[PDB]
Amino acid sequence: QHVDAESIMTAPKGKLFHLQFMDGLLRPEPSAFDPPASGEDMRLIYPLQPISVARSMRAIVNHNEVDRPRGAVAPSSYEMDTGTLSRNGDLLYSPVANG
Amino acid sequence: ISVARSMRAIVNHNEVDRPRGAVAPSSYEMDTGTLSRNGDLLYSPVANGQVGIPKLEVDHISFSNVVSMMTANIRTGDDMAVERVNPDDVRAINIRNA
Amino acid sequence: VSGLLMVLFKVMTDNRLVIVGETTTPMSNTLSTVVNNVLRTTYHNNVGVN
Amino acid sequence: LSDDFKQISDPKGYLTYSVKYEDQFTKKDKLRASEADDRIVGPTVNLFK
């Protein structure tokens, strides 16, 4: 889904735009003998605030078998903390350290 | 004869006892060793701290060995290509300079 | 004698270069401990014979 | 009785994981696992393939 600069400038004030943004973390390296690129890929639109507030995990591949890719994200510990119930019955996280 | 023999009489004499004349495989058949720093195969060190004898150095056969490998086919990529651009004028070429 | 020579020739000209074949990473709890010790994470499905 | 509640089994959450894959990445060493452990752990390992 594409967006001219003209539409970014002249869209109604109340309407929700729908931008797209690449995560190019999982783009494999060029072959050693791919022809050189004289051209320069260019960009105009950027977010002003963090996007990917919803992100839990990222780049689930291996960089060099053992190493971690730059920009990969492991899930937050809280996703995995089955805690217990408080005496009134509310959910709790596990105690951290002691006591 | 039976210089080639590795094992023999793979049956039980009396359930637990060994048949006379049965042969267990030589230990060397089973010694995946390691590689020497130059990359030759070696047997495991015997006792300590003596360095492992290279497998080619001695006459025993060994069937567990460490082979190096490419993780995947290396011919997979695009072939190299160049942009030859022959000279503008043949008469202007400087074949001199020796 | 000729055969030895050709053996010796065929080895002198063995230009083979191994690439990893299909392989498996058995989940360990699924292997008996004697085999779990011998095993090192992964192995070719064509294990061969030792 | 009044139907004050709606009895259910294996409940929906309010939040779910959603995943975008790049299909070209794939580990070559197939990982055999216990059939039981595969049936506990398995929806997860598929979703986070």
Binding site: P28, N62, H63, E65 | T71, A72 | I19, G21, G48 | -
Partner: peptide
Amino acid sequence: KIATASSARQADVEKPADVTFTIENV
């Protein structure tokens, strides 16, 4: 029945290296 004997050698399974298009690593 008559007693019998048999033989077996380990088989070759060498094959040209497979061409995969998928890649293990970023």
